Curated annotation (Swiss-Prot), chain A:
Residues 11-76 form the S1 motif domain. Induction: In response to low temperature. Negatively autoregulated. Induced by cold shock (42 to 15 degrees Celsius) (at protein level). The lineage of its organism: Bacteria, Pseudomonadati, Pseudomonadota, Gammaproteobacteria, Enterobacterales. Disruption phenotype: Mutants are sensitive to DNA-damaging agents. Changing L59R: In nusA1; restricts lambda growth by preventing antitermination activity of lambda N protein. This is Transcription termination/antitermination protein NusA. It is found in: Cytoplasm. It comes from Escherichia coli (strain K12). The chain holds residues 125 to 248 of 495 of the full protein. Part of the processive rRNA transcription and antitermination complex (rrnTAC). The complex forms an RNA-chaperone ring around the RNA exit tunnel of RNA polymerase (RNAP). It supports rapid transcription and antitermination of rRNA operons, cotranscriptional rRNA folding, and annealing of distal rRNA regions to allow correct ribosome biogenesis. Participates in both transcription termination and antitermination. Involved in a variety of cellular termination and antitermination processes, such as Rho-dependent transcriptional termination and intrinsic termination.
Swiss-Prot record, chain B:
This is Small ribosomal subunit protein uS5. Changing R103G: In strain: NEA-314; neamycin resistant. Changing R103S: In strain: NEA-319; neamycin resistant. GO terms for cellular component: cytoplasm; cytosol; cytosolic small ribosomal subunit. Keywords: Acetylation, Antibiotic resistance, Ribonucleoprotein, Ribosomal protein, RNA-binding, rRNA-binding. The N-terminal domain interacts with the head of the 30S subunit; the C-terminal domain interacts with the body and contacts protein uS4. The interaction surface between uS4 and uS5 is involved in control of translational fidelity. One of its GO terms (molecular function) is rRNA binding. GO terms for biological process: cytoplasmic translation; maintenance of translational fidelity; response to antibiotic; ribosomal small subunit assembly; translation. Residues 2-65 form the S5 DRBM domain. Belongs to the universal ribosomal protein uS5 family. Altered uS5 proteins have been identified in a number of mutants. Some mutations in uS5 have been shown to increase translational error frequencies. Some mutants in this protein can partially suppress an alanyl-tRNA synthetase mutant.
Swiss-Prot record, chain C:
SUPFAM superfamilies: Prokaryotic type KH domain (KH-domain type II), Ribosomal protein S3 C-terminal domain. Binds the lower part of the 30S subunit head. Binds mRNA in the 70S ribosome, positioning it for translation. Plays a role in mRNA unwinding by the ribosome, possibly by forming part of a processivity clamp. The lineage of its organism: Bacteria, Pseudomonadati, Pseudomonadota, Gammaproteobacteria, Enterobacterales. Part of the 30S ribosomal subunit. Forms a tight complex with proteins uS10 and uS14. With proteins uS4 and uS5 encircles the mRNA as it enters the ribosome, which may play a role in mRNA helicase processivity. Some nascent polypeptide chains are able to cross-link to this protein in situ. In collided ribosomes contacts ribosome rescue factor SmrB. It comes from Escherichia coli (strain K12). Keywords: Ribonucleoprotein, Ribosomal protein, RNA-binding, rRNA-binding. The keyword Membrane does not apply. This is Small ribosomal subunit protein uS3.
Curated annotation (Swiss-Prot), chain D:
It comes from the Bacteria. The lineage of its organism: Bacteria, Pseudomonadati, Pseudomonadota, Gammaproteobacteria, Enterobacterales. Required for ribosomal protein bS1 (rpsA) to bind to the 30S subunit. It comes from Escherichia coli (strain K12). Belongs to the universal ribosomal protein uS2 family. The chain holds residues 122 to 226 of 241 of the full protein. Part of the 30S ribosomal subunit, contacts bS1. Some nascent polypeptide chains are able to cross-link to this protein in situ. In collided ribosomes contacts ribosome rescue factor SmrB. This is Small ribosomal subunit protein uS2.
Length: 124, 157, 206, 105
RNA sequence: AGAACCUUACCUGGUCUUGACAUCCACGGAAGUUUUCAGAGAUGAGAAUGUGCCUUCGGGAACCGUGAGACAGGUGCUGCAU
RNA sequence: GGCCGGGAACUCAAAGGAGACUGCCAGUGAUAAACUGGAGGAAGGUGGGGAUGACGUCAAGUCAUCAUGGCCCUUACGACC
RNA sequence: AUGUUUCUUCUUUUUUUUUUUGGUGAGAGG
């Protein structure tokens, strides 16, 4: 029910504490006995996390698996860029500006395409 | 970005049976420095909010002037209600002087070569309406080659 | 002649009293005598200790003082030896063992007393009082407290004539006793007068 | 739809339904709109003149059916046509619905 | 929310001036205690005698004197200084 | 002599609440608002009353409740009887 | 019907935490 109430978080930028760092994944503690995973492909190429570090990432998939991590978090995919812009730009959160497309080379360069219906606002 | 420049402060009041409460009419101007000019009208019950509420209209009042080589085009009449200011040409005179409380307005358009003289009544309020209105009906030689003649290059010689 | 305290009209029904213990009329005196002058000596030393309320509940042949601060690290000082120094200077005064309850708050900046002496701690050196208040007011606004009307008094700005103004943000109950709003006041006596302060910070409801 | 009565008195909640319904019909089904649209269709400009004033200050292109009595000072698309009919305005509304049938794909 | 002394800050007279009260400095007196008085009372003039606890036991906190004091005291004014 | 038993009915005693809202009926009125009659009830339209004194005016009073800038007395305007 | 004189102002800069199960007696192995 907590995950259902956090329907926004399941999709937006959840914040976790690094519990364990393995070679292939990072285990995050979200609180309330919820554990999330960032896979190696879901990390930025130059990030180095330590146990106890705070990490933000987009919850891009919830899997009802009988074993393993249920919550998959990304920092590399384009959704991380879109949701960071939604939080940092009020005009995107208010649906005044729309992000139409996002292309990303994680930890190097990204492009976002923005549109607005209000001729008084410069979306760029 | 908006390149703020702020000028005006003077009290206005209301005089109610309680008393007279000093509202603060404050004016400014907003522009790029390379063609987009437009201001906002602001007032509050203090000074720092009035310069902030005048900002939002100046975001939506920017009017372009087709800045030719960072100056004017040709001598235009900025006559409005209270001031009859001319916009005298000075083609790279390299002198940035205009009227009092108009000079700080014509830093935000960007120019460096123009003459002026506020004909009539020395008021700071009719300036910012006219110093865009003088700039408004002003047109670069291309647009008044786009209409008159129906030969662009022949007025260009 | 205006401005009754919503404090004194709402004590007990929503907010507990600042002293609760029984006495007869005959021992109303000696119980009362201890309360003022040691809180005088409490406010002398724990003025910099950021305290919120001092409820003194002294039962028959007993006394307990519930000190409500937010930085007890300077109240206990080191190894709690200064807590007994609060206790040795009160035991031979009232003649009764006076035990001390430093029960702290987790949040200092949502308190009526702390915002009052905040400007007063920075009034000594001449500050533009609006930004000084605005900072604390905004901080206390965004931190959950849904209403604030904040006051300063004296001769603000090095003035001579009478001046007072208030900054309204949110809900202020003075005709609804059900809701939750506090108020305090301290003073600033210096080489130019007494520059005073009131506050009305609103917390909530039932 | 589930509670709204068991948290206060029954007398209060009909004022809420008064607040709900009169802000339902007057805010319409426009709560899931994008806030600032790209166009706004005007049927008549006699007393909806505040819109064509307001829709012009943000550069939003907005239409207009005109009749004999109103002025084009402010509107963009002056289209003639009588504003007093029941089926004909729906014939106009059936015409734009053919365009809005392309205005989804 | 109560003018016989008091309250009382006003007046007459008689008085001490580091002072009714506070903290500190040197030293003394221990502190304490009843009573005879010049006198309106104030204040000041006296006699009998006493001495709990800690003892780092070359003496100290609780009380007053005499001397220098920093100050103390202000119902003396300004509510248009707050 | 409720004085001596008895009683938990009952006045009184004191607590947490139940009790009121134009809820219902009809006329009128713009299907609204709404006034006021009919009903029962302990009470009928904020049931009677108190507490709470908005923004502010009198730059209204107080320095003699207390605080406190300057001022003066500080062998006195301070102190005692 | 009458109601002095000289007297009242105006807004954009200040703000560190945090806490230092032993003994005795006998026997035996090397």
């Amino acid at each position: 029910m907590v995950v259902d109430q956090f329907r926004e978080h399941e999709g937006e930028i959840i914040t976790g504490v690094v519990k364990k760092v393995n070679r292939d994944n990072i285990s995050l503690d979200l609180g309330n006995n919820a554990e999330a995973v960032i896979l190696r492909e879901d990390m930025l190429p130059r990030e180095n996390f330590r146990p106890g570090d705070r990490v933000r990432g987009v919850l891009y998939s919830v899997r009802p698996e009988a074993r393993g991590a249920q919550l998959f978090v990304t920092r590399s995919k384009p959704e991380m860029l879109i949701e960071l812009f939604r939080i940092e730009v009020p005009e995107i959160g208010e649906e005044v500006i729309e992000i139409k497309a996002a292309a990303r080379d994680p930890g190097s360069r990204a492009k976002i395409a923005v549109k607005t219906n209000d001729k008084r606002i410069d979306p760029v | 970005e908006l390149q703020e420049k702020l000028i005006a402060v003077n009290r206005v009041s209301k005089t109610v049976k309680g008393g007279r409460i000093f509202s603060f009419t404050a004016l400014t101007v907003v522009g790029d420095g390379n063609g987009r000019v437009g201001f906002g009208y602001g007032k509050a019950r203090e000074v720092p909010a009035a310069i902030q509420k005048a900002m939002e209209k100046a975001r939506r009042n920017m009017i372009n002037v087709a800045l030719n080589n960072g100056t004017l085009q040709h001598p235009v009449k900025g006559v409005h209600t209270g001031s009859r200011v001319f916009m005298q040409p000075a083609s790279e005179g390299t002198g940035i002087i205009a009227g009092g409380a108009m000079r700080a307005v014509l830093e935000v358009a960007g120019v460096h070569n123009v003459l002026a003289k506020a004909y009539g009544s020395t008021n700071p309020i009719n300036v910012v309406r006219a110093t865009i209105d003088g700039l408004e009906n002003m047109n670069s030689p291309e647009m008044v080659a786009a209409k008159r003649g129906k030969s662009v290059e022949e007025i260009l010689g | 002649g205006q401005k009754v305290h919503p404090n004194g009209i709402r004590l007990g029904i929503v907010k507990p009293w600042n002293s609760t213990w029984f006495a007869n009329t005959k021992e109303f005196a000696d119980n009362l005598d201890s309360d003022f002058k040691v809180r005088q000596y409490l406010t002398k030393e724990l003025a910099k200790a950021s305290v919120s309320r001092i409820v003194i509940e002294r039962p028959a042949k007993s006394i307990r003082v519930t000190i409500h601060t937010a930085r007890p690290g300077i109240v206990i000082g080191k190894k709690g030896e200064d807590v007994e120094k609060l206790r040795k200077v009160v035991a031979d005064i009232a003649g009764v063992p006076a035990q001390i309850n430093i029960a702290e708050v987790r949040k200092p900046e949502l308190d009526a007393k702390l915002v009052a002496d905040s400007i007063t701690s920075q009034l000594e050196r001449r500050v533009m009082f609006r930004r000084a208040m605005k900072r604390a007011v905004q901080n206390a606004m965004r931190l959950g407290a849904k209403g604030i009307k904040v006051e300063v008094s004296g001769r603000l700005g090095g003035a001579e004539i009478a001046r007072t103004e208030w900054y309204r943000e949110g809900r202020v109950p003075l005709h609804t006793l059900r809701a939750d709003i506090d108020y305090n006041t301290s003073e600033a006596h210096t080489t130019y007068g007494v520059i005073g302060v009131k506050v009305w910070i609103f917390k909530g409801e039932i | 739809q589930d509670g709204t009565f068991d948290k206060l008195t029954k007398k209060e909640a009909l004022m809420r339904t008064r607040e709900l319904e009169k802000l339902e019909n007057s805010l319409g089904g426009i709560k899931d709109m994008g806030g600032l649209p790209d166009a706004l269709f005007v049927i008549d400009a006699d007393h909806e003149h505040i819109a064509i004033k307001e829709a012009n200050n943000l550069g939003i292109p907005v239409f207009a059916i005109v009749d004999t009595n109103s002025d084009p000072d402010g509107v963009d698309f002056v289209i003639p046509g009588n504003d007093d009919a029941i089926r004909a305005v729906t014939l106009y509304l059936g015409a734009v619905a053919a365009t809005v049938r392309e205005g989804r794909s």
